[PDB]
Design a protein around this ligand. Sequence first.
Ligand SMILES: CN1[C@H]2C[C@H](OC(=O)[C@H](CO)c3ccccc3)C[C@@H]1[C@@H](O)C2
Ligand SMILES: [Sr+2]
Ligand SMILES: [Sr+2]
Ligand SMILES: [V+3]
Length: 326
Amino acid sequence: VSESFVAPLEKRAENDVPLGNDVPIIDLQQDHLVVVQQITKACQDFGLFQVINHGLPEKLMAETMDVCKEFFALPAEEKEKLQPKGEPAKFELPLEQKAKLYVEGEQLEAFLYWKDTLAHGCHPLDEELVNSWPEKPATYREVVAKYSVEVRKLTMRILDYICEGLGLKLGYFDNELSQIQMMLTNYYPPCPDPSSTLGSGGHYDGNLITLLQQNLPGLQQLIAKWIAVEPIPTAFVVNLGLTLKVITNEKFEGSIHRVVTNPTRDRVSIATFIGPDYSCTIEPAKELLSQDNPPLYKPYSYAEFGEIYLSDKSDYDAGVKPYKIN
Ligand SMILES: CN1[C@H]2C[C@H](OC(=O)[C@H](CO)c3ccccc3)C[C@@H]1[C@@H](O)C2
Ligand SMILES: [Sr+2]
Ligand SMILES: [Sr+2]
Ligand SMILES: [V+3]
């Protein structure tokens, strides 16, 4: 690998990361109250859990993964149509909702992630948005339209379980706090030296909540002990974001996680990031505050948070450090 992709010594993955046997696998077809309670325990203690029997068609999951892998198999001449000015876009504001290929890294010891990313908005689905999506493969738009609607449906169910668990009214997040739905498809090609590379560096998701679909190993969670998140192809991995951490006044944990590279086989993952518009104000939910539970963050601009989050990776919570109070 070129030196571009060489991570700093302290950020490199150990070669023998154990399976996380205490990662909660939550069956959404249990009784309502049991689902609320198990989800609540997972959010308070871990911030990362898998959902099964989640009501999203397994057939559609397999079809979306097929069309995403078909996309990354396309020749250079097709992929160039998604590279503004002949190169991949950067994860910086303004973050546009039209489909683009992205490159990602850290600017500390500057290095690149061993990863290609397709990203686009998904909400609301209109003709203009879908017309900005990939033209090839032919089925991408119709498959990923159905997927994004279904994934949102599931995400809003999970948020309402979360509302019940916290004692917030149902629909608390069904507003400006869940307005942006970015779908990222990540392609990790084989890496000849996995010891010095990362598919994705350690991070909280900056948004509210993320659903991640995987069928191969590579996802790891920090619990300074890293563990491997068992890939269940028919499950979704639920990652609680830094925004939900702030809004719950740290009653919920955020998921700190990373992706390691593989020397022999490639990997494709699908991540749906739901969260606020860049115009939102984020603060601890007033309904939960008291003299016993005083706010640990002052109100802040999501845009202003966005800029720090995407640029400064000196600390996992660099984005929210300026707004910490008490
Ligand atoms: C490792 N990178 C982090 C930053 C960026 O994330 C995004 O692109 C999301 C998309 O919602 C975002 C969240 C919060 C603020 C801005 C962007 C791309 C990827 C993600 O896995 C998380
Ligand atoms: Sr190019
Ligand atoms: Sr177009
Ligand atoms: V993530």
